[PDB]
Structure 1
Amino acid sequence: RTTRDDLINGNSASCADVIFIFARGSTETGNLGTLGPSIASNLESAFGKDGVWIQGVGGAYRATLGDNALPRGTSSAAIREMLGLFQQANTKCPDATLIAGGYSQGAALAAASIEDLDSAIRDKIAGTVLFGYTKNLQNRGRIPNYPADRTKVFCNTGDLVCTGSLIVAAPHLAYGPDARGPAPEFLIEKVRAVRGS
C-alpha cells in the first residue's frame, strides 16, 4: 500500500530487472503517499511482481511542509537519503534499469538528488516523472544534468507551485488520473526503449 521497501528488503541474488524509486509529497503517509501506489500497481502489471522493485524514499525524508522553502525545495538530509537509495540500487543490482519520480516536495527532492548523483548512476535512470514540480519555473521544466527526453513533468494549469509560488491550490491535488495512466505509460515506454521487451 503506502509503504514499499522492495529494494531494501530485496535479495541481491535475485535482483529485479527494474527498480523504481519514488518520493512522496508533503505530509503524505508511508513512503509512497497518495500517487505512488497507483504507479506501482501498473508497473507490476507490465513487468510482473518479481520483475520490478518499488522503493519509496523513507528514512530521513520526513516530507515536512516547511522544507519546501529551503534553497533546493527540500532538506539536505532528505537529499542524502535519496542519494543513498540510488547508491544502494547500483551496488545491489548493477544490471537493473532504474526509474524515478516524485510529487510536490518529492519532485524537488528527486530533481536535487538526480542533479547531485554520480553520472554513472544517473545515466542508468531511464525515465523520471515529476508531478506538481515545485521547481518547474526555476529549473525551466528540467532536472539539472539530466536529459529532457527522459523527463516528464505533469504540472496542472492553476497549480501555483509550477509557476514559482509555494501556495497550495486545488489543482495541486489533482494528479490522480496522471498517476493512473500517462505517468506509468511514460515509465514503461522508457524502460522498454532501452531494455527491449
Structure 2
Amino acid sequence: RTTRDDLINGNSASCADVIFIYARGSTETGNLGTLGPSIASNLESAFGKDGVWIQGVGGAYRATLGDNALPRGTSSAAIREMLGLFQQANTKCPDATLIAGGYAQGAALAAASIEDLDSAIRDKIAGTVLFGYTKNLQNRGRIPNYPADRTKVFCNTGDLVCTGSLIVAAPHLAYGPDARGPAPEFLIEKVRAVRGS
C-alpha cells in the first residue's frame, strides 16, 4: 500500500528481474504516496509479484514542501538517499533492469539523482516517468544526461509547477488516471523493449 521496501528487504539470492524506484510528492505518506501504489499494482500484474521489486524512496527523503525552493528542487540529503538506492540495486541485483518514477518534488528528486548517477547504473534505467515535474520548464522536459526516448513526462494543462512556478493548483492533484494507465504502460513497454534479466 503506501510503504514498499522490496529492494531493502529482498534476498540477493533471489533477485527480481525488474526493480522500480519511486519518489513521492510533497507531504505524502509512506514512501509511495498517492500515485506509487497504483503503478506498483500494474507492474505486479505484468511481471508477477516475484518478478518486480517496488521500492519507495524513504529514509532521509522527508518530502518537505519548503525543499521545492532549493536549487535542484529538493534537498542534497534526499538526492543522496535516492542515489544510495540505485547503488544498492546495482550491487544487490546486477542483472535487473531498473525503472524509475517520481511525482512533483519526487520528480525533481528523480531527475537530480539520475543526472548525478554513475553512467553505468544510469544506463540500466530503461524508462522513467515523471508526473507534475517541477523542473519541466527549466530542463525543457528532459532529465539531464538521460535519453528523451526513455523519459515520459505527464504535465497537466494548468499545473503551474510544469510552467516554472511552485504554486499548487487543482490540475497538480489530477494525475490518478495517468498513474493507473499510461505511466505503467510506458514502463512495461520500455522494460519489454530491452527485456528483464
The alignment status of 1:183 with 2:160, answered yes or no, reads no
Superposition deviation, residue 34 in structure 1: 0.1
The C-alpha deviation readout for 1:35-81, integer Å capped at 9, x for no partner, is 00000000000000000000000000000000000000000000000
Superposition deviation, residue 157 in structure 1: 0.0
SS at match of 1:21: strand
The alignment status of 1:37 with 2:41, answered yes or no, reads no
**Aligned mates of 2:36, 2:126 — CA distance in 1:** 18
**Aligned mates of 1:131, 1:195 — CA distance in 2:** 24
CA pair 196-56 structure 1, distance change in 2 beyond 3 A: closer
The C-alpha deviation readout for 1:139-183, integer Å capped at 9, x for no partner, is 000000000000000000000000000000000000000000000
Superposition deviation, residue 16 in structure 1: 0.1
Q: Structure 1-normalised TM-score?
A: 0.99
**Aligned mates of 2:17, 2:82 — CA distance in 1:** 20
SS at match of 2:28: coil
Superposition deviation, residue 28 in structure 1: 0.1
**Aligned mates of 2:90, 2:78 — CA distance in 1:** 19
**Aligned mates of 2:195, 2:152 — CA distance in 1:** 19
Structure 1: 4+ residue segments shifted above 4 A: none
**Aligned mates of 1:166, 1:35 — CA distance in 2:** 20
Mapping 1:12-23, distance limit 5 Å? 12-23=12-23
Instruction: Give the gaps of 5 or more residues in structure 2.
Output: none
Judge conservation of contact 2:101–2:128 (CA < 8 Å) in 1: yes
**Aligned mates of 1:70, 1:132 — CA distance in 2:** 17
**Aligned mates of 1:68, 1:96 — CA distance in 2:** 31
**Aligned mates of 1:196, 1:8 — CA distance in 2:** 19
The C-alpha deviation readout for 1:7-44, integer Å capped at 9, x for no partner, is 00000000000000000000000000000000000000
Superposition deviation, residue 128 in structure 1: 0.1
**Aligned mates of 1:50, 1:138 — CA distance in 2:** 38
Total equivalences in the alignment: 197
**Aligned mates of 2:62, 2:153 — CA distance in 1:** 23
The C-alpha deviation readout for 1:73-113, integer Å capped at 9, x for no partner, is 00000000000000000000000000000000000000000
Instruction: Give the gaps of 5 or more residues in structure 1.
Output: none
Task: Give the % identical residues.
Answer: 99
Judge conservation of contact 2:17–2:196 (CA < 8 Å) in 1: no
The alignment status of 1:117 with 2:135, answered yes or no, reads no
Superposition deviation, residue 190 in structure 1: 0.0
SS at match of 2:128: strand
Superposition deviation, residue 196 in structure 1: 7.2
The root-mean-square deviation of aligned C-alpha atoms, in Å, is: 0.9
SS at match of 1:85: helix
Judge conservation of contact 2:72–2:112 (CA < 8 Å) in 1: yes
